[PDB]
Amino acid sequence: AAKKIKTLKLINKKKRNDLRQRTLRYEEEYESERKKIIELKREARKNNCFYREAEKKVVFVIRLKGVNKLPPKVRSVFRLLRLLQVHNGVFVKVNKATKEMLKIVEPYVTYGYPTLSTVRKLLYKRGYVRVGKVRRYARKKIQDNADISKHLGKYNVHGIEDMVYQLYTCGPVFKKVNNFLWAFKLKPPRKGFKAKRHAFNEPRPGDWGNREAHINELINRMI
Amino acid sequence: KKRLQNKNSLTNFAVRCRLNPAYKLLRSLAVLRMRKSILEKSKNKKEKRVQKQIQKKELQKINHDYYKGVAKAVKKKKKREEKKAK
Amino acid sequence: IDNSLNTNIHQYHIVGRAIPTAKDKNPNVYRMCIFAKNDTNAKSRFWYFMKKINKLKKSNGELLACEQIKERFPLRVKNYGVLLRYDSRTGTHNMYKEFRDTTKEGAIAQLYSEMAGRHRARASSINIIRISEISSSLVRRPHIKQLLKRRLRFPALHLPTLQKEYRKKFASKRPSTYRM
Amino acid sequence: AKSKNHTNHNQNRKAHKNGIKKPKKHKFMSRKGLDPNFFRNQKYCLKGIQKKKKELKLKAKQEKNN
Amino acid sequence: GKSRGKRSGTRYKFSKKFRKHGECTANKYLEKLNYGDYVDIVCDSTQQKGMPFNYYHGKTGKIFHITKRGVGVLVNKRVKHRIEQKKVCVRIEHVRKSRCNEDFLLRKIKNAELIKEAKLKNEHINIKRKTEGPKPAAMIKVPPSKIITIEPLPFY
Amino acid sequence: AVKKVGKIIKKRTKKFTRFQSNRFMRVKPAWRKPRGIDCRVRRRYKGTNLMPSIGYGSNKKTKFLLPNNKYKYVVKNVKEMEPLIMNHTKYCVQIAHNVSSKKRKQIIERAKQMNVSVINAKARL
Amino acid sequence: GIALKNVGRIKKHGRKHLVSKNPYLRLLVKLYNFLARRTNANFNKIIAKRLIMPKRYRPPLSLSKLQYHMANHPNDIAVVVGSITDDKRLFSLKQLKVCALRFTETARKRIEDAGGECLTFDQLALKYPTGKKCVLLRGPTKARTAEKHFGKAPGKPKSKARPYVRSKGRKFEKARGRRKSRAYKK
RNA sequence: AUUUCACUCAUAUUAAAUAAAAUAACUCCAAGUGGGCCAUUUUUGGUAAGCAGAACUGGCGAUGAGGGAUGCUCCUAACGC
RNA sequence: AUUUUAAAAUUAUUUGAAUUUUUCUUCUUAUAAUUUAAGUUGUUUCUAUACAGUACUUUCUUAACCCACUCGUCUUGAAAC
Ligand SMILES: [Mg+2]
Ligand SMILES: [Mg+2]
Ligand SMILES: [Mg+2]
Ligand SMILES: [Mg+2]
Ligand SMILES: [Mg+2]
Ligand SMILES: [Mg+2]
Ligand SMILES: [Mg+2]
Ligand SMILES: [Mg+2]
Ligand SMILES: [Mg+2]
Ligand SMILES: [Mg+2]
Ligand SMILES: [Mg+2]
Ligand SMILES: [Mg+2]
């Protein structure tokens, strides 16, 4: 019938309004947290104490080596972290277990802590989705919000800013949001590397360590 | 469906607003607050100083004391070791 | 402003302690000052020295501050004295050296170059103790005394350093090195 | 004339080619040689239970048809 | 010639520890075992009857048969591309009630009461264990007098 | 070397000659796959003969078209070219080699009436 | 490069088409493929798959076993994707409604004499499009003699496999390896 | 021990984390192979050896492309047009 | 031959509220059009007022620049003295 159309057209409108409201709330949250951190330190200096900041909860990991000549335990961890070829990148939740998984493969990767605008750029410029029945997935670029809501809106995420929120802060829906995305495929950086052989913390030019907030600079060049 | 060209989701306004139903408001607010500032040049950059006198002079003593103490402790360790040498 | 004259060395102030336990619940607090390329390297050296000197490993400690001390008079000239300790091919040694500069890390950069040139000592075998400023009447080295006379003058005796554009490869008159 | 006589190079590469297989995890096993004088008694118990169950089934089939 | 006997290479594995020789205690014979229990095989060399083979020292299995003074155990063993089940028949002195399972039992008994209360007050509680994770921020108060400055040491 | 005229694209135009066919005259130029250890053509050394592969294949939409941009059908007598009256803008005819001149004249003058083109309407004249 | 297994490609492990060339069977396959697709019923999918299998996976079913399977299902329809055969060991037969790919002459006569009926699959497509009140049945698929030679080799301890022998008697493979008196048993 | 009957144990976040985990499990019929060698690390005989004999991984054999002037095994990296 | 729709954006009239107080301020709370949506469209000239010309298509021949050891076989290893 024709009435089949009007109800759907109304439901889409109400869903869009709700998404707008939630995005505004997210913006308020970002600003308020940013301003609270910036005065707690300023007050600590006055009262002769130190303010140790909360640690991170999220990393972004990039592979540095090819696929030949690797020990089996390294290959198992690469399979479990979904890094399959040279310049791929994924998000990882920070635990006591992932840290020990990560120490195994440290001389072959580089990683660190991402900001908000970096998450937004990764999601908008290089964001691809898995679409289909289970175990048949057909990588598709986003271009729209219906695919997100179809698979993942049961947990109240209908839109792209919702996934940004759940990734930049380890929200309750993080395993599903992260597992929903295809692994990122990145260009080589625009001014080259220094030396993949050596580490970031060695007194020489090198790469392979954990570089905490300097990962944003690198992934803006190899976006 | 047949696949088409993939549109740049950051520089194409129509798809950007399609994906983010709240981006138009934020961009408009930023543009308004950007124009307000330039329309008040030769009338801004003056109040900044008169309030910097208000609060930076209060912060200055605390900062100076902190760094003074750090340097003094670093000196104390040096003298204590040099005297220990003999 | 001129990225061809910069060194990548800065100074940092790091504070740490151990995680409080049931046996110890007011653990000692430690501070240091390190010269490094970025703050991540400085934290690396901080935990290295905590483990070597005290019994503190990173995995049961916690960091409290990283601050990056800046320089107050970046255009005045100072005298500096450094204390070293480095490993040679057949032993380990320690020395005292003196430099002239406008910033502490501007002197640390000179020190690394001199220790590579004169002794073939890599940065991984050098530990820096106690950079400090010294007065002009307590200077010990002859090559610093040279520069603090009453009225310092000398002629300029370098060959020219021209732009790449006016470095014409095939000239019409052979130039001069005199330049008075 | 002399040749190699032992190595196990390549052996667990072949072993892990088709994985390391596990036993099939069944529910019952055979009590053939196991504790006598305890399972003969179990046979008697189960015979009694079956006699009761089938007597009830026969009885119900007898009333339901009147 | 090659020498692959039954007890070859058991010099240090099959010998009593320091100042701890002698036969077992009287309470060893009062242990309670049932079918399906978990069990550890630890060879005791002061009793030469029912001695397990070299390989099965220090392994864990399940009971499948109980006799007058013996126990049958099901133990896994890896053979070159697969795991085979073995049936090991040992005497009662080389058998120990396994302790690998106690955290599960304490967890079940403890969580039962928590679930009973939570459903009593109509609540939504989580009972799965928690991986250790990152830490929140805190304000740590220390007087400037208690901070001590340290620097690398000169060589002696 | 890619050749393209309109919508038709050819991915290569040179033949794949047989290895060693320029040096030994008992070896014919028709392509045969090299088998046998130590070849340097089977092992893909640079600087020698290339091997054909499925990657050079043509577009499905333009796989059998002539530069005329029509498919070719070969006829032997008049009665065989009657199915062309329904599809005359997609096909062109060519006359077989072993038909006589008298038969050819009739085939040509019927193709003219049907408004279909003849590829070789100049032979035996 | 990239580290996948069977690189990026999915494996399937069975028969995909008909091998037979009977035109009537091809028409049946077409019909039940259409029914399976346009009404995903799980009843027409299974039937569409079963009439693709080879001969060894479409065994016959006897009359007595068919009557035994239908004892608690009066006025229902039994569906078999094989032949059904007679059984002299039965004394009497009830009234049954059965759809099967083939009937033998004696079985067909016995079924119709008791008031039952025999159906083909194109009639079952016309009367029970989604299989209401229909019971799917199979015959014994591991009763063939060839399956008595499979499994463990005859000679491994405690096996049940038959051997391949010229003939049978005291002179044909009964001496060493099958009794304790000649050096070991099995 | 078993057999019945009654009551009750988180689940939509899945009784710890992570997972292009069902590309799984099983049965049948068969091919080729059963002279190996090399590198970092551990290691036996020998004054030693581009010698003889073992262990765990990765390779060469069965394999081309960029670099090391040159080179079966080193570094980067594995191959449709 | 009926998902190049819907929606979104834009422009010009509107029906009402905010606030950031405005020639890009917001909220499709009413109609029309347009594309920035919904993978390239237009205008001039030449070939040319030709029928095979020295132009265009194609096949041979001969240069340049870079590169390229003799196949088959046994062998851990072949361009092999
Ligand atoms: Mg470089
Ligand atoms: Mg390496
Ligand atoms: Mg032993
Ligand atoms: Mg061709
Ligand atoms: Mg070879
Ligand atoms: Mg590929
Ligand atoms: Mg041989
Ligand atoms: Mg190779
Ligand atoms: Mg060389
Ligand atoms: Mg031979
Ligand atoms: Mg060979
Ligand atoms: Mg030889």
Ligand SMILES: [Mg+2]
């Ligand atoms: Mg050869």
Ligand SMILES: [Mg+2]
């Ligand atoms: Mg030679």
